[PDB]
Short mmCIF file of C-alpha atoms in Angstrom, two decimals:
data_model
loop_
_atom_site.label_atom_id
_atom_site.label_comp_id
_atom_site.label_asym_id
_atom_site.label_seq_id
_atom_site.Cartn_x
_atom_site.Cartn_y
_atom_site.Cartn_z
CA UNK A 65 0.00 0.00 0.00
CA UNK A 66 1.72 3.20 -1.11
CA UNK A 67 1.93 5.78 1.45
CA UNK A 68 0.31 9.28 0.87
CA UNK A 69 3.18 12.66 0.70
CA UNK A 70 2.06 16.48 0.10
CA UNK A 71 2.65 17.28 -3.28
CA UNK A 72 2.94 21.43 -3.34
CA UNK A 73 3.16 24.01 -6.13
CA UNK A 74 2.59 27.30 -5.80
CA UNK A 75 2.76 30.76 -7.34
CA UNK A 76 2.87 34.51 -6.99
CA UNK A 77 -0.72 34.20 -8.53
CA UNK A 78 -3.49 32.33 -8.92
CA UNK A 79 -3.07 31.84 -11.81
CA UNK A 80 0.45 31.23 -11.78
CA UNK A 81 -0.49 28.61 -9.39
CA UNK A 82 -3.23 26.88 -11.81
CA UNK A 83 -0.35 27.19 -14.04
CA UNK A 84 2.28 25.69 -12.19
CA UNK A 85 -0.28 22.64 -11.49
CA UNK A 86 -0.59 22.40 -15.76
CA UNK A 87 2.84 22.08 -15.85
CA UNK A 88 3.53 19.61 -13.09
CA UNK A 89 1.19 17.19 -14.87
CA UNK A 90 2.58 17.73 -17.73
CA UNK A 91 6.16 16.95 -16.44
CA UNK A 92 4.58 13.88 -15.19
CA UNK A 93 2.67 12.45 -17.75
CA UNK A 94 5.98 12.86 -19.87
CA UNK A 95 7.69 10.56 -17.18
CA UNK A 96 5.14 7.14 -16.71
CA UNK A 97 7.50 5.83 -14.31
CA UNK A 98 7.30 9.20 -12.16
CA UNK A 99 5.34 8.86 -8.72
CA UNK A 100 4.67 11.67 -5.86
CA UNK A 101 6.96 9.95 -3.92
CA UNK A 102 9.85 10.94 -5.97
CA UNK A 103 8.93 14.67 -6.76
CA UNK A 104 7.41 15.56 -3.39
CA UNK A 105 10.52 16.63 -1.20
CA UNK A 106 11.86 18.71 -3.72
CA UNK A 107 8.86 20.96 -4.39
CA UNK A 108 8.96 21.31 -0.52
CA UNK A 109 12.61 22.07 0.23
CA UNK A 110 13.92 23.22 -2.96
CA UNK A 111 11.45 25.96 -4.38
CA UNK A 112 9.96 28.86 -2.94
CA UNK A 113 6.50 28.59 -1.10
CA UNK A 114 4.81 31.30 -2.84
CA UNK A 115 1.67 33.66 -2.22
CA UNK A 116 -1.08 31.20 -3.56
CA UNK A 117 -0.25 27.85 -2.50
CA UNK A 118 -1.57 24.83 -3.21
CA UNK A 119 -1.16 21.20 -2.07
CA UNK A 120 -2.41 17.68 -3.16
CA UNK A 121 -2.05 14.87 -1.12
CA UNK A 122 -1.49 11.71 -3.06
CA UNK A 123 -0.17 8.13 -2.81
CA UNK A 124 -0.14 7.64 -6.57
CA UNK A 125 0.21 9.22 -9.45
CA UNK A 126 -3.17 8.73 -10.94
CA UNK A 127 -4.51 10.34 -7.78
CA UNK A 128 -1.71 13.41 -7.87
CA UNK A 129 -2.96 13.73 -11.67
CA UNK A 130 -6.13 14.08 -10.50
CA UNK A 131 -5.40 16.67 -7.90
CA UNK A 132 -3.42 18.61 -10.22
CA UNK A 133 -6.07 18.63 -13.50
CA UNK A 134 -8.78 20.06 -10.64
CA UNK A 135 -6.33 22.72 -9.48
CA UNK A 136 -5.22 23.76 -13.27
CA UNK A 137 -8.89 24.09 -13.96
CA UNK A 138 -9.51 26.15 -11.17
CA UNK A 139 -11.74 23.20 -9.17
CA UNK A 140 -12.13 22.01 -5.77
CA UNK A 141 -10.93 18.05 -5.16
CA UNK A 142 -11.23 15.83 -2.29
CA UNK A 143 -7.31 15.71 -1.52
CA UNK A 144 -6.73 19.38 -2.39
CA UNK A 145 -5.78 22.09 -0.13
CA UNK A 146 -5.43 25.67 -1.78
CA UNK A 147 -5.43 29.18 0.06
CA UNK A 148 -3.71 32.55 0.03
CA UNK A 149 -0.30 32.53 2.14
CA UNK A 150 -1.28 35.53 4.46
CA UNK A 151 -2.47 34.57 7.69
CA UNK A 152 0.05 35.37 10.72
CA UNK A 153 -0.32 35.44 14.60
CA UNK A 154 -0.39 33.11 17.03
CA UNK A 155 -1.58 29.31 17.51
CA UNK A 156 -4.54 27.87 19.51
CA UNK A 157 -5.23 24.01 19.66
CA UNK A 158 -9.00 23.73 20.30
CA UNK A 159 -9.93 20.42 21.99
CA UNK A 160 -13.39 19.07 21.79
CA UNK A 161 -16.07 17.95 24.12
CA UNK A 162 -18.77 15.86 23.19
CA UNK A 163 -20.18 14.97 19.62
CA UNK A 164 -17.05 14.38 17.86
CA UNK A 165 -16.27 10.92 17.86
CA UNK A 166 -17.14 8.49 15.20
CA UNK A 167 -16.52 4.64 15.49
CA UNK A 168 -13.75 3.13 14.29
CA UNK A 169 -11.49 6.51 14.51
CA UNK A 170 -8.14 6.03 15.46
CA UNK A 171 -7.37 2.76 14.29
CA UNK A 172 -6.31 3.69 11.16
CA UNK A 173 -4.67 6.26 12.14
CA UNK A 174 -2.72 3.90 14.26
CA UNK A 175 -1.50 1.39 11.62
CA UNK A 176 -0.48 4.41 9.50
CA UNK A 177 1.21 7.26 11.78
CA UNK A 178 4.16 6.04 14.30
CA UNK A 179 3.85 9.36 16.58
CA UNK A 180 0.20 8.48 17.00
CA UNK A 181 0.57 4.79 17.32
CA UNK A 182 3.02 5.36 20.33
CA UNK A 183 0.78 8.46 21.74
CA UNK A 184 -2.24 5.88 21.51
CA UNK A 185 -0.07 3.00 23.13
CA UNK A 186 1.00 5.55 25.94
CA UNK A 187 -2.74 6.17 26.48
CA UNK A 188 -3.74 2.73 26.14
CA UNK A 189 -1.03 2.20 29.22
CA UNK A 190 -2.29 4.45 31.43
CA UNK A 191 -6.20 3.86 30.73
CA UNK A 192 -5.50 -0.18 31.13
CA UNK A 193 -4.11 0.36 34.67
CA UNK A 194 -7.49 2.87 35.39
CA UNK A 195 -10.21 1.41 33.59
CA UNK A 196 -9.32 -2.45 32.91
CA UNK A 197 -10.20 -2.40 29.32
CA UNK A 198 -7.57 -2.42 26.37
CA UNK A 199 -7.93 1.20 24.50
CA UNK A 200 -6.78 -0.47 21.05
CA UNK A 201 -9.87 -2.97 20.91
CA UNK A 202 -12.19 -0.55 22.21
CA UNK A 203 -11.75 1.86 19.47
CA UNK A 204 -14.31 -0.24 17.03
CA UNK A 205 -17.13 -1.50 19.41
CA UNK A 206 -19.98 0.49 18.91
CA UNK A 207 -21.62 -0.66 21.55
CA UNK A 208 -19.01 0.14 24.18
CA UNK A 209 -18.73 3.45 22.75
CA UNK A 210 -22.12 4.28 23.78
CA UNK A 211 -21.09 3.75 26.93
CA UNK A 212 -20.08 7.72 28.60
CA UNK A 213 -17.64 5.68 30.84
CA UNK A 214 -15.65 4.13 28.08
CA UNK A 215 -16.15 7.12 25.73
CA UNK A 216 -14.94 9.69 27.31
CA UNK A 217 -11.48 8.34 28.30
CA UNK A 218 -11.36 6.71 24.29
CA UNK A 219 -11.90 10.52 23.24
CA UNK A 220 -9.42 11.84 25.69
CA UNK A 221 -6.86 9.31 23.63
CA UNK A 222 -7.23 10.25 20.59
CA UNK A 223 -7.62 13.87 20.70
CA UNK A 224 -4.55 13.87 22.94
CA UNK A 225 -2.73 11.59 20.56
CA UNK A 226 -3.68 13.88 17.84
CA UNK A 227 -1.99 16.47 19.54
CA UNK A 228 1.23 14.66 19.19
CA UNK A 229 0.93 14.06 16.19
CA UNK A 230 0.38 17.77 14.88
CA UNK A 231 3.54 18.55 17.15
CA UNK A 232 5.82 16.06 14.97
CA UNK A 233 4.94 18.16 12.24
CA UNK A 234 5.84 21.73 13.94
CA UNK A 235 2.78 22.75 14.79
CA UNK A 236 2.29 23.60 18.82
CA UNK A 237 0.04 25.41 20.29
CA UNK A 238 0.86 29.13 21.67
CA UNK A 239 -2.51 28.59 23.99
CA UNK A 240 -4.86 25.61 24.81
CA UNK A 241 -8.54 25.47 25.27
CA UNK A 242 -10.65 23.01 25.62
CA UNK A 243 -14.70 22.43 25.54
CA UNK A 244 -16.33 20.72 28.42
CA UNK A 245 -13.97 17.18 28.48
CA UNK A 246 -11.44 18.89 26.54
CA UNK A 247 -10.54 20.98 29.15
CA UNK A 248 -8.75 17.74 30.90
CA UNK A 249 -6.99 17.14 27.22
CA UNK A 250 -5.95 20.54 26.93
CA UNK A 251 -4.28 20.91 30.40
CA UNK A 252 -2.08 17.64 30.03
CA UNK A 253 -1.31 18.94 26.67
CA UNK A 254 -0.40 22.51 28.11
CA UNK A 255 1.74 20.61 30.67
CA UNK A 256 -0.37 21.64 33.72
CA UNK A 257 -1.23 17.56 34.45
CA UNK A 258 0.58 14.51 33.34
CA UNK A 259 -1.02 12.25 31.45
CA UNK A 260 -1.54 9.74 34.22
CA UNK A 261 -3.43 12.72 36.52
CA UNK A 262 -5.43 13.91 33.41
CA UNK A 263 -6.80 9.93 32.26
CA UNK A 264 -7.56 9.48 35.78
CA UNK A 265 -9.79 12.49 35.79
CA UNK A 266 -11.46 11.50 32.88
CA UNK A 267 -11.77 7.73 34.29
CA UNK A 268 -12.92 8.94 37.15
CA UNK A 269 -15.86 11.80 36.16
CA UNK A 270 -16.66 9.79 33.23
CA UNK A 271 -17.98 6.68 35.29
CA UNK A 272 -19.18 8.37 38.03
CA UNK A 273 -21.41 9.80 35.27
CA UNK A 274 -22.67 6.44 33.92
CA UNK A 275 -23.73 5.38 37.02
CA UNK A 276 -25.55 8.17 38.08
CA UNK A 277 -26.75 10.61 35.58
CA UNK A 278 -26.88 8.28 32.23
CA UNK A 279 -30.39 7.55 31.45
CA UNK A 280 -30.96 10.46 32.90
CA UNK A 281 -30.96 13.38 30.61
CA UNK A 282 -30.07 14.59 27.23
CA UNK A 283 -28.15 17.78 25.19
CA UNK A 284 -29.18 19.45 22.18
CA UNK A 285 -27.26 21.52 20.25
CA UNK A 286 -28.94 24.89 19.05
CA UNK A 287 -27.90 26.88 15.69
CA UNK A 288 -29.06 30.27 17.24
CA UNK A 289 -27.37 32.79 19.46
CA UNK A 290 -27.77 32.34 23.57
CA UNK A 291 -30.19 35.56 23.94
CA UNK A 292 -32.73 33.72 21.41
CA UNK A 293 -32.10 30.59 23.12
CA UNK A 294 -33.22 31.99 26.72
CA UNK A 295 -36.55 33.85 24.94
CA UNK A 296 -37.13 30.12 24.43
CA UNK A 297 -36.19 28.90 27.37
CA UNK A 298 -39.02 30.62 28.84
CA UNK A 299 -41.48 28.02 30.57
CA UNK A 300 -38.76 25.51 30.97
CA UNK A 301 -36.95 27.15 34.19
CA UNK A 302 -35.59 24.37 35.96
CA UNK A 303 -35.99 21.99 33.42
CA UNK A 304 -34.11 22.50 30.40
CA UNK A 305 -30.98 25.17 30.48
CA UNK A 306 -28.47 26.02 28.73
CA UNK A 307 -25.32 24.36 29.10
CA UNK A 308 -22.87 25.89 26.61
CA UNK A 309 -22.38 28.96 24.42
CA UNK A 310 -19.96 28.40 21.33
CA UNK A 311 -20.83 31.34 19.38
CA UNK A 312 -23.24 33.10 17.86
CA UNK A 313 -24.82 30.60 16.07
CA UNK A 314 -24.28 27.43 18.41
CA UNK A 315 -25.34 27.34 22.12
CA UNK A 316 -26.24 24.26 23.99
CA UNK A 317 -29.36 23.21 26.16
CA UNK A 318 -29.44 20.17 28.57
CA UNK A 319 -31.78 18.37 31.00
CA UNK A 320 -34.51 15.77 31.31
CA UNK A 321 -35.12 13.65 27.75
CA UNK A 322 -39.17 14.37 27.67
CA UNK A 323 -38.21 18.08 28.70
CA UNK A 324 -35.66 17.88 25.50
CA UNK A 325 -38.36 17.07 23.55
CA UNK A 326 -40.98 19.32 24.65
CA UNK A 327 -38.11 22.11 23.59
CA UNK A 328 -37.19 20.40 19.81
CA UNK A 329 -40.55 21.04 19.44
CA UNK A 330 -40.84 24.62 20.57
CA UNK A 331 -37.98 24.55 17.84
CA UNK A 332 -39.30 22.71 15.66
CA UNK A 333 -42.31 24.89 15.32
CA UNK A 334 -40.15 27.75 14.13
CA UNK A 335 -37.85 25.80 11.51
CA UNK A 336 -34.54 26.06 14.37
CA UNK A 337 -31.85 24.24 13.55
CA UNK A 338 -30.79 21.47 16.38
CA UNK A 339 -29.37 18.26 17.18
CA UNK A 340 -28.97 16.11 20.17
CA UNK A 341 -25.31 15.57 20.98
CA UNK A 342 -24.08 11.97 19.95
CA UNK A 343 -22.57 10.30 22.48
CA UNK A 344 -24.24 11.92 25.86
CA UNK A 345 -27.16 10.35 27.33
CA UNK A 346 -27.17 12.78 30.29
CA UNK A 347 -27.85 16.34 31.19
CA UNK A 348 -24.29 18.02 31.63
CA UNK A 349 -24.05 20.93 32.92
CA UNK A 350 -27.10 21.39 34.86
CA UNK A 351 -28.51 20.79 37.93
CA UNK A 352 -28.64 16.84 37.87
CA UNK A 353 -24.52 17.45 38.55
CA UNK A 354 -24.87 18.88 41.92
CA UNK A 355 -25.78 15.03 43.16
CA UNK A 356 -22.41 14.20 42.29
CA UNK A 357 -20.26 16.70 43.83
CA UNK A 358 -19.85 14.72 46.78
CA UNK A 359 -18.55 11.47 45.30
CA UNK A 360 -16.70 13.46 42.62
CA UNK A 361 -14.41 15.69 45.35
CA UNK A 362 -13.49 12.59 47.29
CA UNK A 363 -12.67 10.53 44.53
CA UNK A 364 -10.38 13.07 43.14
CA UNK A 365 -9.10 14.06 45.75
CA UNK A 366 -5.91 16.19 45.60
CA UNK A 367 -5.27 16.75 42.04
CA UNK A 368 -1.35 16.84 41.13
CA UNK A 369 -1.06 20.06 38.89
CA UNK A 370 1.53 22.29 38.02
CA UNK A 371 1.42 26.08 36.45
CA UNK A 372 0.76 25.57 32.64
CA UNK A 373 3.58 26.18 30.54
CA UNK A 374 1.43 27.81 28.27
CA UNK A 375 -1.73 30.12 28.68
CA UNK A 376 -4.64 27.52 28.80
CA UNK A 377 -7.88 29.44 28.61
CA UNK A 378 -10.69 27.96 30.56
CA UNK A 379 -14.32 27.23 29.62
CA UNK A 380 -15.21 27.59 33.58
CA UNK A 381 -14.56 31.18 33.53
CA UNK A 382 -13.62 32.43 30.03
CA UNK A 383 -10.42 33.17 31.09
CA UNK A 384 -7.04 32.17 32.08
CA UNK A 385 -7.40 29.30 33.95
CA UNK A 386 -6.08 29.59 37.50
CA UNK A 387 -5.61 26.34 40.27
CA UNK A 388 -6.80 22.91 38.66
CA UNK A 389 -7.76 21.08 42.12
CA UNK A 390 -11.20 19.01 42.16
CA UNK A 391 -13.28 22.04 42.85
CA UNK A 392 -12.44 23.29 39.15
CA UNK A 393 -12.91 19.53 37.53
CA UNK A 394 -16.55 19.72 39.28
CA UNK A 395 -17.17 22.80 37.91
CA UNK A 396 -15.86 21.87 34.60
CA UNK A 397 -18.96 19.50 34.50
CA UNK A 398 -21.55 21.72 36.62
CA UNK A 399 -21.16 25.02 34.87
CA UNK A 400 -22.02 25.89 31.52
CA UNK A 401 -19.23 26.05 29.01
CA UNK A 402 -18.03 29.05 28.17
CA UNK A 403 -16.20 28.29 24.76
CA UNK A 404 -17.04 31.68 22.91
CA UNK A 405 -15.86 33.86 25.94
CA UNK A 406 -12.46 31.81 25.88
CA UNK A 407 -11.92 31.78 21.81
CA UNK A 408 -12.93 35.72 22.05
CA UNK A 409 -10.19 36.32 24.70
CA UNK A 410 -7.15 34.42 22.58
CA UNK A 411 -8.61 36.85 19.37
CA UNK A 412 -8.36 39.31 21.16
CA UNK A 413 -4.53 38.40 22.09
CA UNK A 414 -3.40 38.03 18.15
CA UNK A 415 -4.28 34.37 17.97
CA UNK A 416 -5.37 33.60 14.25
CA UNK A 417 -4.28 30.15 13.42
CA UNK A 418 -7.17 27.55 14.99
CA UNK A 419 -6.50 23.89 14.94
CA UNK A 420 -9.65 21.87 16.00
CA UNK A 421 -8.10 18.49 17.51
CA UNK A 422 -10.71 16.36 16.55
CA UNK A 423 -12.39 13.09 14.34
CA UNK A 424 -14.70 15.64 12.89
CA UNK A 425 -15.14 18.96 13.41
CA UNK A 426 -17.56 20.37 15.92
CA UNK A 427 -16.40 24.00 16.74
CA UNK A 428 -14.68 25.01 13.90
CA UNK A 429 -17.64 27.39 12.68
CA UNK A 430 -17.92 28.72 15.80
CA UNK A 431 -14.17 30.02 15.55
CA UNK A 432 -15.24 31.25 12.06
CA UNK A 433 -18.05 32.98 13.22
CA UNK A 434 -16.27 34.46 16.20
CA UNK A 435 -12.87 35.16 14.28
CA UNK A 436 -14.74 38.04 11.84
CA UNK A 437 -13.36 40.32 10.63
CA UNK A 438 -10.00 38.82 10.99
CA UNK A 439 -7.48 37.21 8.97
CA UNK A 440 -7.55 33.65 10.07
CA UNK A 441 -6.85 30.10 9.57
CA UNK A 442 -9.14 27.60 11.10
CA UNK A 443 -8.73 23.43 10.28
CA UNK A 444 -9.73 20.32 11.84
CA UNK A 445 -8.21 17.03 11.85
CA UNK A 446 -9.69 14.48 11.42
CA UNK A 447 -13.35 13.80 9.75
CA UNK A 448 -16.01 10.80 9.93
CA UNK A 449 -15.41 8.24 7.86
CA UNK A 450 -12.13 9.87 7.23
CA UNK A 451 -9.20 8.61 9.44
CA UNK A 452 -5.99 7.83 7.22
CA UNK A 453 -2.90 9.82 7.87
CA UNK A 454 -3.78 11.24 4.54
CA UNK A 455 -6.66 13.07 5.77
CA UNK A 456 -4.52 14.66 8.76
CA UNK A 457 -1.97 15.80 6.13
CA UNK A 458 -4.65 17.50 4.31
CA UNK A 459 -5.32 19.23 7.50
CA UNK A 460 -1.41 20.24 7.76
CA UNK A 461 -1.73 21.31 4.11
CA UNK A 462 -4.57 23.61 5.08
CA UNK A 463 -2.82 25.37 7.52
CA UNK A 464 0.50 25.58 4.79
CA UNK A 465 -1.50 27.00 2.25
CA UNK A 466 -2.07 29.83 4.27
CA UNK A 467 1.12 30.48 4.98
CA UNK A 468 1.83 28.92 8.45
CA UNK A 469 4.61 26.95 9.69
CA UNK A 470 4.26 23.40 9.68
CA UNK A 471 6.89 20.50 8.64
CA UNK A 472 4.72 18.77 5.85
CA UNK A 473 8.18 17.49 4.77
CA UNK A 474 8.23 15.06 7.66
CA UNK A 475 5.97 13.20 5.72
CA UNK A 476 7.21 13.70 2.22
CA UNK A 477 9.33 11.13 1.67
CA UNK A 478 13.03 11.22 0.41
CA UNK A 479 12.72 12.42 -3.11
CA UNK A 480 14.90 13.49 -5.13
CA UNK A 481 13.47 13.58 -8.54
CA UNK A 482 13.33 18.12 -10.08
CA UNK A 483 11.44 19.76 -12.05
#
C-alpha cells in the first residue's frame, strides 16, 4: 500500500499557481514511471513557497494527476488544499467535548502514523491500569462506545494523541482550550497535568457519570445565538438550560429527555436548527450534577497540577485558567461552558491560526463565526469516515496553504526527482 506525501506548487498568482499545477502534470505524464513519492521533497525544500499555495495529497500518481487537473482548472478536489499565504499570529489548539467521535477513529490512524501509534499506546497504558479495558480494541465497538464511561477516556486518547501528532509536524500550540472534556486534554497537553493525573480524571468523572446521571438526561445543540435561546427557554426554568455557548450561532441546552423534547418542538415549530449531541445520554451541565459533587471531590481528591507552561484558557470562567484542584474539575462539568468567551479572549490576544483536535469537526464554525473580521486560519483534523494519515496531512496542508509553519516534509518522503 503506497503511502500518501504532500505534493505542493505554488505561485505569486493564482493563476500562476493553476499554471504551475498544468505544468507539473505535464512533467509527469511525460515521465510514466514518475510517482509523488519521488517529486514531493523537492517541491517542498527546494522551491519557494509562494503567495497562492496549493497542495495535493497523493499516494499515486493517478490520484496526484487528479489533484493537479482540478487545481489547473480552477476546481475544488477531495485531496486538495489551496489558500492565500497571508495569515500570521499566534496558535490555539482547540480540543473538543462531546459529539465528535465516530466509530472506528483512530485505528487507522494507528497502523499508519508512528507518533500516533506510540501516543495511543502511551494512552492505552495508562487507561488499562485505570479502567481495565484495552484502548486499542475498544476503538471499534460500537456498543461500548455508547457507553459515557468508556467514551470519554477513548476521546481523551485520541484527541490527545492527535496532539502529538500535529507537534511532529511543527505545529504547537501558543494557547490551549478546551470544551467541556477537553478541558482535561488541553491541560495535560499545556503541561499543567501529566497524562496519568489527566486519564484518571477522565476515568474517574466519566464513570461516576454512567452510574448516576446516564439515562438520565439529554443535550441538544442549538444553531441560534444564547439571547434567542433563553426567549425560548421561557417556561422551561428548571428543566431544560443552557449548558454551553460556542458562538453566535451554536449554544447548547441540557436536561430531562421528555423536557428535551418538549423544547425540539418549541424549535421545531419555528424551523430552528438542532441536534442532540451523539454520544451523551445525560444532562451536563445542569442541575442533575450537583448530586455528584460529593462522590466526585473525594474521589479526586488532591489533584497533582503544576502552572501551565502555556496560557490555557478555561471554559469555567472564560479566562485564564487559575488552580486545577477538584473544585475546578466539578465545575468543569456543573457550569455551563463558556467556549465563545475563551476563543474571544485568545482573538483578542493576536491568535489567528485555529487547529480543531478532533475526528470531525464540531467548533470550527464557531471560531469562524467568532474570528470576523479577521485574517484567520481555522482546520480540523480528522473527519467521519475519514481517518488515514492522509486526511490529517490535508489538514497540515490547510494550515501551509495559508502560509503557516508546519513540517509537511516530515511526511514527504526522500525524493529526489526536479522539475
Amino acid at each position: 500500500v503506497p503511502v500518501p506525501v504532500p505534493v505542493a506548487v505554488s505561485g505569486a498568482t493564482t493563476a500562476g499557481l493553476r499554471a504551475q499545477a498544468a505544468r507539473l502534470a505535464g512533467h509527469l505524464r511525460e515521465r510514466p514511471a514518475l510517482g509523488p513519492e519521488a517529486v514531493a521533497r523537492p517541491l517542498l525544500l527546494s522551491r519557494a513557497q509562494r503567495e497562492r499555495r496549493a497542495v495535493v495529497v497523493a499516494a499515486d500518481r493517478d490520484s496526484l494527476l487528479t489533484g493537479l487537473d482540478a487545481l489547473a482548472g480552477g476546481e475544488a478536489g477531495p485531496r486538495l488544499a489551496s489558500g492565500a499565504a497571508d495569515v500570521t499570529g499566534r496558535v490555539v489548539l482547540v480540543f473538543p467535548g462531546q459529539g465528535a467521535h465516530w466509530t472506528g477513529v483512530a485505528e487507522r490512524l494507528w497502523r499508519e502514523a508512528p507518533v500516533f501509534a506510540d501516543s495511543m499506546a502511551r494512552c492505552a497504558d495508562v487507561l488499562r491500569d485505570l479502567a481495565g479495558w484495552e484502548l486499542r480494541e475498544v476503538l471499534v465497538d460500537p456498543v461500548a462506545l455508547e457507553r459515557v464511561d468508556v467514551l470519554q477516556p477513548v476521546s481523551f486518547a485520541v484527541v490527545v494523541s492527535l496532539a502529538a501528532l500535529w507537534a511532529s509536524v511543527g505545529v504547537r500550540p501558543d494557547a490551549v482550550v478546551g470544551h467541556s472534556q477537553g478541558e482535561v486534554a488541553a491541560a495535560h497537553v499545556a503541561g499543567a497535568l501529566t497524562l496519568a493525573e489527566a486519564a484518571r480524571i477522565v476515568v474517574l468523572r466519566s464513570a461516576l457519570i454512567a452510574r448516576e446521571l446516564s439515562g438520565r438526561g439529554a443535550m441538544l445543540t442549538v444553531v441560534a445565538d444564547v439571547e434567542r435561546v433563553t426567549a425560548l427557554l421561557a417556561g422551561f426554568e428548571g428543566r431544560v438550560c443552557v449548558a454551553a455557548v460556542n458562538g453566535p450561532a451554536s449554544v447548547t441546552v441540557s436536561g430531562e429527555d421528555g423536557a428535551v423534547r418538549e423544547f425540539e418542538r418549541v424549535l421545531s415549530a419555528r424551523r430552528m436548527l438542532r441536534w442532540r449531541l451523539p454520544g451523551v445520554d445525560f444532562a451536563g451541565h445542569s442541575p442533575q450534577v450537583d448530586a455528584l459533587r460529593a462522590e466526585l471531590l473525594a474521589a479526586l481528591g488532591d489533584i497533582a497540577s503544576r502552572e501551565p507552561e502555556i496560557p490555557l484558557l478555561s471554559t469555567v470562567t472564560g479566562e485564564p485558567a487559575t488552580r486545577l484542584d477538584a473544585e475546578h474539575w466539578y465545575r468543569n462539568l456543573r457550569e455551563p461552558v463558556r467556549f465563545a468567551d475563551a476563543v474571544t479572549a485568545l482573538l483578542d490576544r493576536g491568535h489567528r491560526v485555529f487547529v480543531e483536535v478532533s475526528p470531525h469537526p464540531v467548533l470550527t464554525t464557531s471560531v469562524v463565526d467568532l474570528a470576523a473580521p479577521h485574517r484567520t486560519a481555522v482546520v480540523g483534523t480528522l473527519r467521519r469516515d475519514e481517518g488515514g494519515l492522509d486526511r490529517f496531512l490535508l489538514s497540515a496542508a490547510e494550515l501551509h496553504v495559508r502560509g503557516v509553519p508546519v513540517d509537511l516534509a516530515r511526511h514527504a518522503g526522500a525524493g529526489t526527482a526536479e522539475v
